[PDB]
C-alpha cells in the first residue's frame, strides 16, 4: 500500500500561501524512501532518521509557494508576514517541513502573478487557520465602501517571479507534514 505522496510533492501547480492546499492522508503505508535534488528537510519533534518506522493516525500535507527569504518563517515560534497573516505553525508542532527551489516551474520571463500573499490583516492567524476572504482593508476612518482608494487597499499582493531574480526572491515550493496521533486506532504505519 502506497501513500499518495506522489500527488503532493510532484504536483504540477501549487496554490498560493494565502489559500494553502491541505490534503488528508490515512489508511496507507507511509514510506518516506520517496523523499530521496537540492532541498531543505527540517523535522520538528520527531527523528527524521526513522520516519519510515513510525506509526501514527493522520498525516496532513499542506502545500504552498513562498519566496526563499520566507522559508525560515515556516517554523514554530516565528514571526513575519507569512507567519502572521498567511500560515502559522503552532508552538508544539510535531511534524516536518520540506522546501525546495522551483525556479524551473514557477517562474516565467514575463513574470508570474498567479501566486498571491495576504499583506494586510487586522489580527494574527491561529495555527492552521485559512484566510480566504478578499475584502478591502480599512487603513483609515473613511469607509472603503467596496472601492480601493486612499487608506483602503486590496489585502492580497502578488509575487514577482522571474528567472533573472536572485535566489532569495526565487519561488520555493514548501510542503509541511503535520503528524497527528489519536486515541482512535491509527491507520498510517510505515
Amino acid at each position, epitope marked *: 500500500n502506497l501513500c499518495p505522496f506522489d500527488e503532493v510533492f510532484n504536483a504540477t501547480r501549487f496554490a498560493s500561501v494565502y489559500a494553502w492546499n491541505r490534503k488528508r492522508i490515512s489508511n496507507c503505508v507511509a514510506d518516506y524512501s520517496v523523499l530521496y535534488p537540492f532541498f531543505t528537510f527540517k523535522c520538528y519533534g520527531v527523528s527524521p532518521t526513522k520516519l519510515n518506522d513510525l506509526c501514527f493516525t493522520n498525516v496532513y500535507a499542506d502545500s504552498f509557494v513562498i519566496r526563499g*527569504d520566507e522559508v525560515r518563517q515556516i517554523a514554530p515560534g516565528q*514571526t*513575519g*508576514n507569512i507567519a*502572521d*497573516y498567511n500560515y502559522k505553525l503552532p508552538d508544539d508542532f510535531t511534524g516536518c517541513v520540506i522546501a525546495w527551489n522551483s525556479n524551473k516551474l514557477d517562474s516565467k520571463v514575463s513574470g508570474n502573478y498567479n501566486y498571491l500573499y495576504r*499583506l*494586510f*490583516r*487586522k*489580527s*494574527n492567524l491561529k495555527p492552521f487557520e485559512r484566510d480566504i476572504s478578499t475584502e478591502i*482593508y*480599512q*487603513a*483609515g*476612518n*473613511k469607509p472603503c465602501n467596496g472601492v480601493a482608494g*486612499f*487608506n483602503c487597499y486590496f489585502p492580497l*499582493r502578488s509575487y*514577482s517571479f*522571474r528567472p*533573472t*531574480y*536572485g535566489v*532569495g*526572491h526565487q519561488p520555493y515550493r514548501v510542503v509541511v507534514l503535520s503528524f497527528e496521533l489519536l486515541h482512535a486506532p491509527a491507520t498510517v504505519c510505515g
Partner: antibody
Amino acid sequence: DVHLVESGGGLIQPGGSLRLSCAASEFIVSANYMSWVRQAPGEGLQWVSVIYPGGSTFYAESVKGRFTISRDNSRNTLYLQMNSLRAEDTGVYYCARDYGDFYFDYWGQGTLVTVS
Amino acid sequence: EIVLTQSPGTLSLSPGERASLSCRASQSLSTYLAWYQQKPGQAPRLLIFGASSRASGIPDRFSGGGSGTDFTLTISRLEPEDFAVYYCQQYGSSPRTFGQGTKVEI
C-alpha cells in the same frame, strides 16, 4: 487630516530613558504598519523599528534590547520607549506609515533627540 | 543589508531640463527600490516606489526605471523646487537600508 505629529524629544543624559509619541489623524495605528526612522545630523536615513497591524515588532540590529515600539489604540498614538540611550542615538526621529513592510508613504514632522 | 551606493555625490544643473541619479546595489533587488526627496529642514517625501511607479501628488516630471542592481531616477524639467536631497531605499531584504543621499545644486 493625514498629519502625523511627533513629540517627546529633548535633551537626555546618556544612559537615560526617553519616550517618543506620534499622534495620528485619519490613520488607524492599530490597523497600519507603523515605523520609526531616525536621521543623524547631516547623515543618511536609518530605519529603527516597525510594528505590524497584528502586533509583531521588529527592530534594527543596533537598537534591539533597548528600544521598544508600542501602540495605544485608545488615543491612536504610536509610542517608542528608548532605554540606555547612547551618544550615537542623537538625531531627528520620524514616525512613518510603512505601506506593508516596503516603503514609507507618509512622514511626520520629526522631533530632535539629543544625548547630552 | 544590501549596501546602496549613489554614484554622483553632488549634481549641479541649471534650472533647465535634465537630471539623472543612479543607485547601485551590491546584490540584486528586483524592482524593490524606492526614491524619496528631502527638502532641507523638512521630512522626506516619497516619490517613486517599485522603482518605476509614481505615488500620489508627485508631478509627471519625476520618473524612474531600473531592475537588478542599477536603478535610475530622472527629472524631465528641473524646476527650482526639485533642488533638494534624494535618497534611494530598498525593501528586498531586511532591514530597509538607505543610500548616502544625492544633493542637487544650481
